Design a protein around this ligand. Structure first.
Ligand code: A1AM6
Ligand code: ZN
Length: 140
């Protein structure tokens, strides 16, 4: 579990979005595994605006933050998980590291701020849904 709290937006994995998220929906994309809802209180996070390929992510199934190198966001085939069938996921970055389903929502960050959230795992990789292209998160 986990979210990004930027301005008056909550960014969550689409598959973990709640009824309240859907009732306060700003934007969602199944192919990216993202959903954004509106918040009453302003949030503490800054979104990275960069093309970094190194950062640090939180792994809840280890209670640990790990430094990783990661691929640039791409359209990638993802094998079946507990929460999605085998399918193509867009705007996905991969690193070598540990990720189980409940790790979804952990933040990946670089020197510029939040890069994305854990969205995939298995086979010794962790996949992150990028948010650095979503420039509208920084205003309004
Ligand atoms: C949500 C649904 C599409 N899933 C969940 C069950 N399943 C699976 N596959 C691999 C590992 C664990 N569970 C495939 C079908
Ligand atoms: Zn960066």
């Amino acid at each position: 579990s986990g979210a990004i709290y930027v301005g008056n937006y909550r960014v969550v994995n689409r598959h973990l979005a709640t009824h309240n998220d859907w009732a306060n929906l700003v934007w969602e994309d199944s192919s990216r595994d993202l959903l954004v809802s509106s918040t009453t209180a302003q949030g503490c996070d800054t979104i990275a605006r960069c093309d970094c390929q190194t950062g640090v992510y939180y792994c809840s199934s280890r209670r640990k933050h790990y430094p990783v190198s990661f691929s640039k966001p791409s359209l990638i085939f993802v094998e079946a998980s507990e929460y999605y069938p085998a399918r193509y996921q867009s705007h996905l970055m991969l690193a070598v590291g540990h990720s189980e389903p409940g790790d979804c929502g952990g933040i990946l960050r670089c020197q510029h701020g939040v890069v994305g959230i854990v969205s995939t795992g298995g086979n010794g990789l962790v996949g992150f849904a990028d948010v650095r292209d979503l420039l509208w998160l920084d205003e309004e």
